[PDB]
Amino acid sequence: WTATSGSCKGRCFELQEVGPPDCRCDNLCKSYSSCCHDFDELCLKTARGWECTKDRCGEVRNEENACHCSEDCLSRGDCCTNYQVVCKGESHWVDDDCEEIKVPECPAGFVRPPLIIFSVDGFRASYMKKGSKVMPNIEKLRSCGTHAPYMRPVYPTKTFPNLYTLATGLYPESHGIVGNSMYDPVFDASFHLRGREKFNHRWWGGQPLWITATKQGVRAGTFFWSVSIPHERRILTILQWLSLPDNERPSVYAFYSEQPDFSGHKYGPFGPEMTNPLREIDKTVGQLMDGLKQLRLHRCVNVIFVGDHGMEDVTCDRTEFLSNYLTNVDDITLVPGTLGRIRAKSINNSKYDPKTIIAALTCKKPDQHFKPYMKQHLPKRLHYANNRRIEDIHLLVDRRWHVARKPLDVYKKCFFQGDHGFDNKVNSMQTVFVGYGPTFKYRTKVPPFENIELYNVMCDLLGLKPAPNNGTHGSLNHLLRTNTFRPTMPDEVSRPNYPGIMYLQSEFDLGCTCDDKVENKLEELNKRLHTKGSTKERHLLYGRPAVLYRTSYDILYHTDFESGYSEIFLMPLWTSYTISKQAEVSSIPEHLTNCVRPDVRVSPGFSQNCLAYKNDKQMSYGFLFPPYLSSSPEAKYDAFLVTNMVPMYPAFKRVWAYFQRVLVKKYASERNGVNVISGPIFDYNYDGLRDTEDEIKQYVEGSSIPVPTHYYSIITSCLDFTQPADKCDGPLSVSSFILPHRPDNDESCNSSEDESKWVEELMKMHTARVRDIEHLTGLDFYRKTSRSYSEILTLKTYLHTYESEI
Ligand SMILES: *[C@@H]1O[C@H](CO)[C@@H](O[C@@H]2O[C@H](CO)[C@@H](O[C@@H]3O[C@H](CO[C@H]4O[C@H](CO)[C@@H](O)[C@H](O[C@H]5O[C@H](CO)[C@@H](O)[C@H](O)[C@@H]5O[C@H]5O[C@H](CO)[C@@H](O)[C@H](O)[C@@H]5O)[C@@H]4O)[C@@H](O)[C@H](O[C@H]4O[C@H](CO)[C@@H](O)[C@H](O)[C@@H]4O[C@H]4O[C@H](CO)[C@@H](O)[C@H](O)[C@@H]4O)[C@@H]3O)[C@H](O)[C@H]2NC(C)=O)[C@H](O)[C@H]1NC(C)=O
Ligand SMILES: C=C(C(=O)C[C@@H](C)[C@H]1CC[C@@]2(C)[C@@H]3CC[C@H]4[C@H](C(=O)O)[C@H](O)C[C@H](O)[C@@]45C[C@@]35CC[C@]12C)C(C)C
Ligand SMILES: [Ca+2]
Ligand code: NA
Numbered sequence: 001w002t003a004t005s006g007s008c009k010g011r012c013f014e015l016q017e018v019g020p021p022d023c024r025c026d027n028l029c030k031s032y033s034s035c036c037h038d039f040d041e042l043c044l045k046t047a048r049g050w051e052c053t054k055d056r057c058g059e060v061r062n063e064e065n066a067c068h069c070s071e072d073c074l075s076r077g078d079c080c081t082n083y084q085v086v087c088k089g090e091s092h093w094v095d096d097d098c099e100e101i102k103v104p105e106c107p108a109g110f111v112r113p114p115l116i117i118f119s120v121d122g123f124r125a126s127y128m129k130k131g132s133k134v135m136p137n138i139e140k141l142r143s144c145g146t147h148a149p150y151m152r153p154v155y156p157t158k159t160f161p162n163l164y165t166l167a168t169g170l171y172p173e174s175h176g177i178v179g180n181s182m183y184d185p186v187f188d189a190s191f192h193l194r195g196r197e198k199f200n201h202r203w204w205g206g207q208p209l210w211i212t213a214t215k216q217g218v219r220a221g222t223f224f225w226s227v228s229i230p231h232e233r234r235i236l237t238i239l240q241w242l243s244l245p246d247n248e249r250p251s252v253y254a255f256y257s258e259q260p261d262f263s264g265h266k267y268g269p270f271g272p273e274m275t276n277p278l279r280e281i282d283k284t285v286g287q288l289m290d291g292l293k294q295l296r297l298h299r300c301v302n303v304i305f306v307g308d309h310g311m312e313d314v315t316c317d318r319t320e321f322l323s324n325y326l327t328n329v330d331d332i333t334l335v336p337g338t339l340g341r342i343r344a345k346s347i348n349n350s351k352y353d354p355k356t357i358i359a360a361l362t363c364k365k366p367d368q369h370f371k372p373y374m375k376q377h378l379p380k381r382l383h384y385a386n387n388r389r390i391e392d393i394h395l396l397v398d399r400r401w402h403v404a405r406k407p408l409d410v411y412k413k414c415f416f417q418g419d420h421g422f423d424n425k426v427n428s429m430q431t432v433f434v435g436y437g438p439t440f441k442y443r444t445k446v447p448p449f450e451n452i453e454l455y456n457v458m459c460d461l462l463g464l465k466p467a468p469n470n471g472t473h474g475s476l477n478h479l480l481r482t483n484t485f486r487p488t489m490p491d492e493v494s495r496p497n498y499p500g501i502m503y504l505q506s507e508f509d510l511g512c513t514c515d516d517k518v519e520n521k522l523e524e525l526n527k528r529l530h531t532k533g534s535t536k537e538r539h540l541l542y543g544r545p546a547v548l549y550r551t552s553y554d555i556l557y558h559t560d561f562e563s564g565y566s567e568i569f570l571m572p573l574w575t576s577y578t579i580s581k582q583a584e585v586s587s588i589p590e591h592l593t594n595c596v597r598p599d600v601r602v603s604p605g606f607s608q609n610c611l612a613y614k615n616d617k618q619m620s621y622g623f624l625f626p627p628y629l630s631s632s633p634e635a636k637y638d639a640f641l642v643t644n645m646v647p648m649y650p651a652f653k654r655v656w657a658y659f660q661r662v663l664v665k666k667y668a669s670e671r672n673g674v675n676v677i678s679g680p681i682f683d684y685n686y687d688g689l690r691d692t693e694d695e696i697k698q699y700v701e702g703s704s705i706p707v708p709t710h711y712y713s714i715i716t717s718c719l720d721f722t723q724p725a726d727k728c729d730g731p732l733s734v735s736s737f738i739l740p741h742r743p744d745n746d747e748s749c750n751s752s753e754d755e756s757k758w759v760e761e762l763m764k765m766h767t768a769r770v771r772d773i774e775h776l777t778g779l780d781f782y783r784k785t786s787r788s789y790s791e792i793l794t795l796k797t798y799l800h801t802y803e804s805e806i
């Protein structure tokens with residue numbers, strides 16, 4: 001109930017939302033069906049429209065008017081935004097040359113530059129350039145401020161997940177808004193765009209910017225606007241709040257536009273009808289900036305112009321139907337569209353089996369335009385698994401397509417030409433970022449980055465301490481003139497042992513064999529030097545990764561590679577080696593095919609054993625440093641050490657061997673040498689974080705050899721590729737992957753073909769940020785470079801996406 005009997009007189013667009021049943025006068029009251037009876041009359045005036053005219057200049061104040069053209073209007077703070085242009089011979093903000101804002105130029109009583117977030121729904125990255133002709137205010141912000149060529153949204157690329165990621169710096173799996181539609185099995189409640197459940201606070205996790213601000217004594221505007229409030233009124237209301245006395249004035253504001261998304265759905269991202277929506281958004285930006293200039297705030301406020309996701313061509317006829325694959329279609333509930341989430345229609349149906357569903361949706365049609373996954377097998381870069389609101393079964397849909405349950409869902413439930421929601425590395429899903437103001441840099445282009453990072457920066461812009469979040473604070477310091485955050489490297493927690501030769505061959509009862517018995521102070525002193533780390537500066541180029549949790553591990557040096565070998569997990573945490581552009585690939589020799597050699601530095605009791613592999617009929621093994629890339633026949637023996645071995649399913653070995661034999665050398669040819677760091681990952685609870693020893697669900701049969709869920713590699717080279725990776729003067733270039741360690745290649749429909757037709761495609765899908773590998777391993781890389789730490793933080797958040805140019 002709401003006793004809407006109170007009055008909004010003197011309360012229009014109040015910031016403090018008042019409690020039931022007292023009627024509300026804030027920008028969300030309409031949405032809660034809760035506004036006082038006179039809210040429209042007093043708060044949403046429209047008379048005479050939104051622009052001053054010559055005949056209105058110096059008029060007598062008429063309180064009925066939407067905005068004012070009278071002489072008192074500037075002090076009152078309620079002029080039309082074009083008032084000084086029409087009445088005082090001033091220029092529009094867009095028509096002024098840009099001039100660098102070296103310091104804030106704010107009126108007295110401003111304690112810090114305000115922040116205004118201007119968020120546009122469905123604003124595809126390529127609109128900045130393709131629409132630049134019809135967007136002159138936006139184009140001036142972009143070209144005069146700091147911009148990225150694009151900004152990467154989170155998966156799924158839908159409105160609510162992304163708008164709440166912007167506000168919190170969290171992945172959807174962490175903030176809990178995992179789609180526009182959700183079922184929470186614990187609450188037994190459903191969340192939908194239309195309905196009352198979405199208003200319930202229990203859905204919304206983490207700590208959004210407005211709560212962060214409020215809790216730290218920084219006043220916030222109310223971020224969101226009921227759909228019926230026209231954009232011109234939203235702008236005028238922001239400009240009003242900015243004219244409030246110092247003790248009442250908010251320090252952060254948001255404007256939100258439903259466009260161009262709304263038109264994009266109807267017309268496609270580039271439908272000819274899309275020009276007018278882009279003009280309209282630009283006019284709105286122009287009104288803000290003229291209004292700011294009027295208040296002498298246009299060289300004082302920081303403005304972020306930011307989108308939530310882009311828009312793709314999607315029509316009705318490009319729909320896959322689950323009824324075409326499954327006999328049992330009415331036994332499931334599907335959350336459909338540009339992603340699929342499947343669960344049992346009924347909890348009482350014990351004939352429901354996810355395995356049989358996955359199988360029936362796996363590579364069944366030539367051009368099948370979706371791919372099923374259990375959620376833990378989704379690419380780790382998506383960070384889309386650790387929430388009970390995300391169903392176990394997921395359909396990753398091809399761009400341009402939809403999945404649906406049955407044809408009747410699609411013609412009896414076409415209109416649309418655009419949609420979004422797809423994999424967040426798809427070029428059409430990319431969105432925009434522009435920062436303009438005293439705190440941002442001047443005419444600066446910054447590389448693409450992810451929207452998870454912005455929360456930290458908005459906290460920085462406001463002098464707030466950010467809540468714990470998934471950004472990497474400092475990785476966007478290069479966007480900023482001032483207010484940078486100077487993080488320090490985490491302290492290493494465990495220090496390594498450096499074991500020498502401590503064990504005789506006969507102490508090992510591992511069931512391994514090696515034709516290595518075939519046998520000089522020249523090279524014998526030389527190879528002892530190699531075991532002491534004499535070639536380490538070649539193979540460990542950025543220092544050793546720091547271990548950020550308590551554990552017991554050994555650094556092992558070899559001619560061709562260095563490693564940090566875990567005595568707990570019985571295998572390396574990391575293996576680091578450099579391959580020059582001129583390195584040669586050799587074969588595994590015949591007499592070494594099945595060779596595994598004990599490592600005299602590491603006890604039997606801390607080693608793997610070959611018997612365990614012989615007796616495990618599902619498990620084989622691979623090597624982290626590839627034997628194919630030994631520097632010499634003699635050095636090749638090091639690669640067959642039991643301490644270089646890791647468990648690998650035969651299906652996975654096909655992937656790994658092709659990577660090691662073919663791709664590494666190829667990368668070295670293309671990048672002028674590469675430094676590779678490889679290693680296992682264990683994430684049995686799919687939370688994106690390194691498992692402790694007690695969390696491992698699977699071991700090599702009869703042993704304590706834990707089976708990795710994933711294998712990573714971090715491949716680093718010189719950004720300036722005319723310098724060799726090992727002698728690089730400047731910035732680095734990286735790409736990385738996290739490959740799921742799976743006993744089949746069902747993910748790859750083409751896998752019965754030669755690896756050259758499917759392995760690289762698999763690896764591209766499982767591309768990763770170094771930061772992702774860090775969360776998953778508790779390692780910190782790039783500890784010793786010549787580079788600034790913020791620059792290394794940026795490198796660590798880099799994702800190599802393999803998409804062609806935006
Ligand atoms: C991205 O950034 C975020 C934030 O930095 C990272 O997420 C954090 O990860 C931490 C480790 O997983 C986690 O710490 C846990 O917190 C528990 C208390 O949490 C409550 O309070 C906080 C703080 O205000 C609040 O934010 C939480 O909100 C979550 O939960 C509600 C659920 O309704 C949601 O509304 C909300 O969206 C959020 O959900 C998300 O997180 C939870 C986990 O908390 C997931 O389950 C959800 O799916 C969703 O992803 C909470 O309200 C605390 O109880 C935990 O402590 C247990 O575990 C530790 C391990 O060290 C152990 O020492 C403790 O003793 C304790 O164990 C006991 O409970 C066990 C399980 O019940 C049991 O097995 C034991 O026997 C013990 O009895 C834990 O410390 C932190 O909460 C989240 N924060 C957020 C905001 O999500 C995230 O990791 C980052 N991602 C990446 C890839 O880096
Ligand atoms: C849980 C908290 C919240 O604030 C919860 C808070 C984040 C939630 C509660 C209400 C909510 C679901 C609104 C619903 C109506 C919608 C509008 C409309 O449909 O008329 C509009 O079209 C776009 C938009 O999607 C919109 C405004 C929102 C967005 C998010 C909101 C504000 C704490 C953290 C304070
Ligand atoms: Ca884990
Ligand atoms: Na085996």
Ligand code: NA
Pocket residue numbers: 745746747748749750751752
């Ligand atoms: Na296959």
Ligand SMILES: [Zn+2]
Pocket residue numbers: 122159261262265420
């Ligand atoms: Zn949309």
